Design a protein around this ligand. Structure first.
Ligand SMILES: O=c1cc(-c2ccccc2)oc2ccccc12
Ligand SMILES: [Zn+2]
Lengths: 161, 47
């Protein structure tokens, strides 16, 4: 049920998504081990993901959270990086996409820093890097991130090193 | 998959050492996220 619509680089929607990608890059405490050494990206394509069933799945739950939190979904746009991006865009997020060993328990993790999500694209800790060169810092191979609408509702605040 | 803390819908990982780190978030229900954009890209070697 999923279709992918390309955005033209001229579409202001392409431009605002690119700007969130680029402007939320940071340096990482691992010196680039997990995700590679870079200060910015070359954006090859941005596609709108359309799936009516998955969208209605999202908005149904959104209204439930909202109704439990004085009509405030507390909705954000956040990045997700995963080896399972293709299963995610076709079948939606579920338990198979959770980070069992995450610092806040076994859930589905999202980042404000694009460069944080980039560290997970080839797996946990960058896995063994790109399929073709086994290079966590590969400058050649094409990577994919998701920029996601996430309902946070009432969020438990965890201060954390 | 775990559960949200009782009375909450998500967890926020507030950065607490690295002053430049932004927040990270966790949801415990797949239906609380919709993947709006698929972005294809390369990281670039710094000059
Ligand atoms: O974008 C993120 C993606 C993942 C991830 C972890 C395990 C399996 C699949 C994806 O982990 C993160 C952890 C922190 C912040 C962002 C992310
Ligand atoms: Zn490669």
């Amino acid at each position: 049920g999923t279709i992918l619509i390309d955005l033209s680089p001229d579409d202001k929607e392409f431009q605002s998504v690119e700007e969130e990608m680029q402007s939320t890059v940071r340096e990482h405490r691992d010196g680039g081990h997990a995700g590679g050494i870079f200060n910015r990206y070359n954006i090859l394509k941005i596609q709108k993901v359309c799936n009516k069933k998955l969208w209605e799945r999202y908005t149904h739950r959104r209204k439930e959270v909202s109704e439990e939190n004085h009509n405030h979904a507390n909705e954000r746009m956040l990045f997700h990086g995963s080896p399972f991006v293709n299963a995610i865009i076709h079948k939606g997020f579920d338990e198979r996409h959770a980070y069992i060993g995450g610092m806040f328990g076994a859930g589905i993790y999202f980042a404000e820093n694009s460069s944080k999500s980039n560290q997970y694209v080839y797996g946990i800790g960058g896995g063994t890097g790109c399929p073709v060169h086994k290079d966590r810092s590969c400058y050649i191979c094409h990577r994919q991130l998701l920029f996601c609408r996430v309902t946070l509702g009432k969020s438990f605040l965890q201060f954390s090193a | 998959m775990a559960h949200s803390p009782p009375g909450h819908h998500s967890v926020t990982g507030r950065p607490s050492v690295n002053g430049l780190a932004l927040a990270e978030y966790v949801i415990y229900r797949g239906e609380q996220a919709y993947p709006e954009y698929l972005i294809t890209y390369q990281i670039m070697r710094p000059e």
